[PDB]
Amino acid sequence: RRAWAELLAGRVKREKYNPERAQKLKESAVRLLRSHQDLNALLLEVEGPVIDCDSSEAYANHSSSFIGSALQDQASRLGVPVGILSAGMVASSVGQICTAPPVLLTVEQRKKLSSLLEFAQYLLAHSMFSRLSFCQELWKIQSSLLLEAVWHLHVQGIVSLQELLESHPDMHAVGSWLFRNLCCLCEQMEASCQHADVARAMLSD
Amino acid sequence: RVQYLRQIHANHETLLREVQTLRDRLCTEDEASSCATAQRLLQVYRQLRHPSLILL
Amino acid sequence: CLDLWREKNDRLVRQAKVAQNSGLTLRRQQLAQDALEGLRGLLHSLQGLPAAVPVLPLELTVTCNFIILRASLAQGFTEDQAQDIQRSLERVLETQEQGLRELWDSVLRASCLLPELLSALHRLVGLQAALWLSADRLGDLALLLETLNGSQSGASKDLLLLLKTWSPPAEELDAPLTLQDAQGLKDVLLTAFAYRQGLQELITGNPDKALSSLHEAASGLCPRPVLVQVYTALGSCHRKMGNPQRALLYLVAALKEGSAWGPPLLEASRLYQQLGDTTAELESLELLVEALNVPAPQFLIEVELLLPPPDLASPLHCGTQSQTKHILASRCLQTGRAGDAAEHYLDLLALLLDSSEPRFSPPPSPPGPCMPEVFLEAAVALIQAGRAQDALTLCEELLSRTPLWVSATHLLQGQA
């Protein structure tokens, strides 16, 4: 009977549901089905065996309107909304640039980054960009990234730090990643007064 | 002064990030493009139009 | 007098449509079962006349309205409707014997004599075929429609092409009313047969042939509960082929458009199992557990009449909160989140044993493991957690209530 009393559980019986909790459930479910979606994989599925190079067809031109119609063509084939393609491709090209060689990156990396971001702004203007998909696809990278890159995103007005840091699953991972990066930074901004300007700007930001 | 200009900037950026999330939901066909979207934006419109462009 | 009977039909059909549009749950069925008896009495009055060539296009109209309204309210068919149709056709013939198949042969040659009531006959064919397509008589159905069109269409043993070849012979010109017409039922035929063909090929292991007919489902009427289920079905096709990123498409569409997003989250659980994304899988099923807590008819043949109740083998099978909470706790325990699994097991077991006052949870089918197996799985979970006194309580309780499971009981009692 002590046995029984120790078994007798409580939050077992549940009843009525709020139709807001229904949408919250469907929302966290849709969020999950896209988080474990990848676009690279999708492209390799439908089309048999992705870069700006892939869509634009072996360095044809670098014109914004051209590349927009390419993403329309791609999304038409795949039946995915053009926003997320654009996000994934831009994030893949971010990974590329940031990997090819510590905090800052201030030669030619900056130039590629600025030309790519110049196209991100065109994409946003024409409504061919999901911010949220993009933030998810960056946290999928989460190691390649430099704090300079994220500050360029912030200041160029493509994400806000608040929209990024509040779209990562594990808040502690973000915290520790930043903690290490900011420790390396405040060790830096002593290497030169030129790099210290950019570092001090983003630190104050 | 400064207090009043920062009051305005923060009041705007809250709306702006809210609109931006709203734009992406319209990109992902998340919400709807029936309406309540429209009726939401005609609530933002009215918020702003009351003291539009105090000129000093 | 045809005018009077005609008037009555008109009146009561309009009264039924009024109940369909307006009305509360009780008042709807009140006016409906009123119109029903109106049509019964009318049937009997006309069934009291010999033949009457001019009456038949009305009688058949009436029987059709009767059956529809009958079957719509029953939310299901019967054999009295077969006998109703039996009677109607026999009457058709006795103007100018064996069983429905030879009757229809003689009937449709009797219609190639060209009495202008084909509008009605073709509607009868629709209804007959709905009985035969509720009752798995697809061989006889295709035979009927082969007879209807040219028998040169002898080798087209596929239905989905014969149903489209079948042409309603009018826009249903100024005759008595109907609750539904030839095209409006053809459109239900094609979608119902497509859905059925698809589910059989899927479970039978052709997640290749499914895709054709499951696209023919959405292309023609798909009431949005029919689309939700067509999309889970296509998620299942692609998951079985090993194409997870396509399956995810159709499943997100089903989440969005649906009010019952259990069967898709189940399909997602199975996807993450196939891959190994055990955290994603567990979180998908957690959401499904939450989702199965949360929860209309027309005086007209819809499609959800001509669909079967799903097998256990279907991707559309969904149990109860208890059946799923065990799946979650089992799938948690095997993975090694024993604490979470044990908590889930305890909150499963309380739901079955403490439940005298509330609604009693249903058992998860005959194939599902017996009660004592479940006490044992719970005790294993408890052990894995390190909740040994709780496992002892479990085992004491089992033996107080009441072979292999007894020996095992003592075993887990020891491990505790």
UniProtKB/Swiss-Prot annotation, chain A:
Report the subcellular localization: Nucleus; Cytoplasm
The UniProt entry annotates the motif Nuclear localization signal at 1-16
Q: How is it modified after translation?
A: Phosphorylation is required for the formation of the nuclear complex. Not phosphorylated in cells derived from groups A, B, C, E, F, G, and H.
This protein's source sits in the domain of life called Eukaryota
- Result of mutating A149V? In FANCA; benign
What's this protein's function? DNA repair protein that may operate in a postreplication repair or a cell cycle checkpoint function. May be involved in interstrand DNA cross-link repair and in the maintenance of normal chromosome stability.
How is the quaternary structure described?
Belongs to the multisubunit FA complex composed of FANCA, FANCB, FANCC, FANCE, FANCF, FANCG, FANCL/PHF9 and FANCM. The complex is not found in FA patients. In complex with FANCF, FANCG and FANCL, but not with FANCC, nor FANCE, interacts with HES1; this interaction may be essential for the stability and nuclear localization of FA core complex proteins. The complex with FANCC and FANCG may also include EIF2AK2 and HSP70. Interacts with FAAP20/C1orf86; interaction is direct.
**Illness association:** Fanconi anemia, complementation group A: A disorder affecting all bone marrow elements and resulting in anemia, leukopenia and thrombopenia. It is associated with cardiac, renal and limb malformations, dermal pigmentary changes, and a predisposition to the development of malignancies. At the cellular level it is associated with hypersensitivity to DNA-damaging agents, chromosomal instability (increased chromosome breakage) and defective DNA repair.
Q: Name it.
A: Fanconi anemia group A protein
According to its UniProt entry, this protein's organism is: Homo sapiens (Human)
Tell which residues of the whole protein are contained here: 19 to 237 of 1455
UniProtKB/Swiss-Prot annotation, chain B:
Where found, per UniProt? Nucleus
- Transmembrane stretches, start-end: none
Q: Which domain of life is it from?
A: Eukaryota
Coiled-coil residues are none
What is the role of the protein in this entry? Plays a role in Fanconi anemia-associated DNA damage response network. Regulates FANCD2 monoubiquitination and the stability of the FA core complex. Induces chromosomal instability as well as hypersensitivity to DNA cross-linking agents, when repressed.
Q: How does it assemble?
A: Belongs to the multisubunit FA complex composed of FANCA, FANCB, FANCC, FANCE, FANCF, FANCG, FANCL/PHF9, FANCM, FAAP24 and FAAP100. Forms a subcomplex with FANCB and FANCL.
Protein name, entry field: Fanconi anemia core complex-associated protein 100
Q: Which organism is it from?
A: Homo sapiens
Q: Which gene encodes it?
A: FAAP100
User: Which span of the parent protein is shown here?
Assistant: 826 to 881 of 881
Swiss-Prot record, chain C:
On assembly, the entry states: Belongs to the multisubunit FA complex composed of FANCA, FANCB, FANCC, FANCE, FANCF, FANCG, FANCL/PHF9 and FANCM. The complex is not found in FA patients. In complex with FANCF, FANCA and FANCL, but not with FANCC, nor FANCE, interacts with HES1; this interaction may be essential for the stability and nuclear localization of FA core complex proteins. The complex with FANCC and FANCG may also include EIF2AK2 and HSP70.
Q: What's the main place this protein lives?
A: nucleus
Key word Repeat present: yes
Q: Which portion of the complete protein is shown here?
A: 12 to 462 of 622
Is Repeat among this UniProt entry's keywords? yes
Q: What does this protein do?
A: DNA repair protein that may operate in a postreplication repair or a cell cycle checkpoint function. May be implicated in interstrand DNA cross-link repair and in the maintenance of normal chromosome stability. Candidate tumor suppressor gene.
Give the disease association. Fanconi anemia complementation group G: A disorder affecting all bone marrow elements and resulting in anemia, leukopenia and thrombopenia. It is associated with cardiac, renal and limb malformations, dermal pigmentary changes, and a predisposition to the development of malignancies. At the cellular level it is associated with hypersensitivity to DNA-damaging agents, chromosomal instability (increased chromosome breakage) and defective DNA repair.
GO cellular component terms given for this protein: chromatin; cytosol; Fanconi anaemia nuclear complex; mitochondrion; nuclear speck; nucleoplasm
Q: What is this protein called?
A: Fanconi anemia group G protein
GO BP field:
DNA damage response; DNA repair; interstrand cross-link repair; mitochondrion organization; ovarian follicle development; response to radiation; spermatid development
Q: What is the effect of changing S365A?
A: No effect on BRCA2-, FANCA-, FANCF-, nor XRCC3-binding
| Molecular functions per Gene Ontology | damaged DNA binding
Subcellular location(s): the record lists: Nucleus; Cytoplasm
Task: Please give the tissue specificity annotation from the record for this chain.
Answer: Highly expressed in testis and thymus. Found in lymphoblasts.
Q: Where are the TPR repeats?
A: 228-261, 322-355
